[PDB]
Amino acid sequence: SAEHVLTMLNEHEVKFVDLRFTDTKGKEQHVTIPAHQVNAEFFEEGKMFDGSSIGGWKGINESDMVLMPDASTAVIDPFFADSTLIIRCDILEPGTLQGYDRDPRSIAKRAEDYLRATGIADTVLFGPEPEFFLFDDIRFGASISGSHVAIDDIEGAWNSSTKYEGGNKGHRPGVKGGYFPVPPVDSAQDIRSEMCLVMEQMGLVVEAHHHEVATAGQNEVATRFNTMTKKADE
Amino acid sequence: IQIYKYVVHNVAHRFGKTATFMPKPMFGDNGSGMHCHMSLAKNGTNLFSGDKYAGLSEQALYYIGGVIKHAKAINALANPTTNSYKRLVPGYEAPVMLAYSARNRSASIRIPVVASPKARRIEVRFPDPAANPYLCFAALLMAGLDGIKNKIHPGEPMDKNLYDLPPEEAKEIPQVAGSLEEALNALDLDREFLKAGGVFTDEAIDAYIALRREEDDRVRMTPHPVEFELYYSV
Numbered sequence A: 001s002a003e004h005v006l007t008m009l010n011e012h013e014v015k016f017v018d019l020r021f022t023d024t025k026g027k028e029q030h031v032t033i034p035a036h037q038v039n040a041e042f043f044e045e046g047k048m049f050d051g052s053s054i055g056g057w058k059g060i061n062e063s064d065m066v067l068m069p070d071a072s073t074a075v076i077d078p079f080f081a082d083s084t085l086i087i088r089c090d091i092l093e094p095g096t097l098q099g100y101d102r103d104p105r106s107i108a109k110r111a112e113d114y115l116r117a118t119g120i121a122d123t124v125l126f127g128p129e130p131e132f133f134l135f136d137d138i139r140f141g142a143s144i145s146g147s148h149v150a151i152d153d154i155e156g157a158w159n160s161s162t163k164y165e166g167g168n169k170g171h172r173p174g175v176k177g178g179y180f181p182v183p184p185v186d187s188a189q190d191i192r193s194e195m196c197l198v199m200e201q202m203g204l205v206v207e208a209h210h211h212e213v214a215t216a217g218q219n220e221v222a223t224r225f226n227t228m229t230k231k232a233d234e
Numbered sequence B: 001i002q003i004y005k006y007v008v009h010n011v012a013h014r015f016g017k018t019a020t021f022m023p024k025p026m027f028g029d030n031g032s033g034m035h036c037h038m039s040l041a042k043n044g045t046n047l048f049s050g051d052k053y054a055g056l057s058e059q060a061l062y063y064i065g066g067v068i069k070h071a072k073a074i075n076a077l078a079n080p081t082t083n084s085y086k087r088l089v090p091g092y093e094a095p096v097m098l099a100y101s102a103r104n105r106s107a108s109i110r111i112p113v114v115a116s117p118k119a120r121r122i123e124v125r126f127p128d129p130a131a132n133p134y135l136c137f138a139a140l141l142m143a144g145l146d147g148i149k150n151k152i153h154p155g156e157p158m159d160k161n162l163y164d165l166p167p168e169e170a171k172e173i174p175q176v177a178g179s180l181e182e183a184l185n186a187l188d189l190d191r192e193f194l195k196a197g198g199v200f201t202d203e204a205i206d207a208y209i210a211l212r213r214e215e216d217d218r219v220r221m222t223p224h225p226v227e228f229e230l231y232y233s234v
């Protein structure tokens, strides 16, 4: 929270603070503020924007909204070159400071509140198992004369015939066969574990990691469940 | 047939193409077959028209019986290549079942449903163009004659539906050779019907079996591309 956050700023000699939130489609957004702009004020009433610039939130007249830092979400970015602290925010309507109808995070919080209000239970537990793909090259496009998409990865079964400049090493997962062969067939052990270490450094708890069924790099990192809204943050 | 192949090969050449009579050049698409329509005659009368099944004479049925009895041996001549067996593969249209029918296509012997008794005959569908027309045709005949000389009843017609109508009694219907090695074997053992009338001699048969046996060796001994797809990462 506020009190704790001011600590992390000095403990890590933080130079910037990255304000993050999620749009209607579900894509994380951000804006960066120098560490020196963080103060008492900031936590109680946030900082606002020229928002009319986002999608599904665009009202021609009433374009201004408030970014409300949630001090509990503070975490250091492990990629940025300059020490920067990430702080997830809620989008609140100005003055009222109630919580934008179209803010996905506010909506999830309202649903958690409503669970308690009906007395049916006090907490909702969520454990998503999101899967993904790791490729080497992805190309696509669409114009009046045509369209196309070309996927490529070192694991793609279609590359069994490809000439590589240091020679084709040939150990790759066939179609629907990338399940659990040990390396070198599975080329992502080091990659997955790095993802796990970092996820944990960012507050997540990892339960397992493994290659998935598809060829061309399907992978998965299983993380531990958590309360609904916190899990969506995760 | 020899003149036919000559014209095809040379007209193709003369047009900047290249023709092949190989039974199965591509996996995943149709192979090339050489169905053989046949009938016997005496003093201008078709000995195959009668009162029996689909207009057939009983003489025609014994002919069929003979072909079914000696099918695997006939295969060594009508399907003389290892490639031939990549066409005669449990497909649904693939004529591999040793049975006769006017409609069923699983049946390797179709009975042309025809108007005039003058045109009644049988169509042995398993031969392919790689077959030596002389030896293949002769073998078909000699088998049919052994069916007649010995009144070999062809059993009942298979009008129902193919083995894709899987194991109903495991569907232990007689089938054609599943490989060249097997057809060659059959020809070795089941050679008597051919030696009849001193048509085929032992040396003639053994000489043939040996030529084909060395061709079979090349294919059985040489690593296949697909074996790498399947076993390189073993």
Ligand SMILES: Nc1ncnc2c1ncn2[C@@H]1O[C@H](COP(=O)(O)OP(=O)(O)O)[C@@H](O)[C@H]1O
Binding pocket: A125, A126, A127, A128, A129, A207, A208, A220, A222, A223, A224, A225
């Ligand atoms: N109430 C609950 N009690 C225990 N585990 C839960 C509960 N609610 C959700 N979970 C979550 O189930 C999820 C894991 O599934 P997992 O089978 O290991 O994934 P995958 O087989 O797809 O790689 C975890 O995120 C787990 O913590």
Ligand SMILES: [Mn+2]
Binding pocket: A129, A131, A212, A220
């Ligand atoms: Mn999974």
Ligand SMILES: [Mn+2]
Binding pocket: B035, B123
């Ligand atoms: Mn035909």
Ligand SMILES: [Tl+]
Binding pocket: B030, B031, B032, B033
């Ligand atoms: Tl065909």
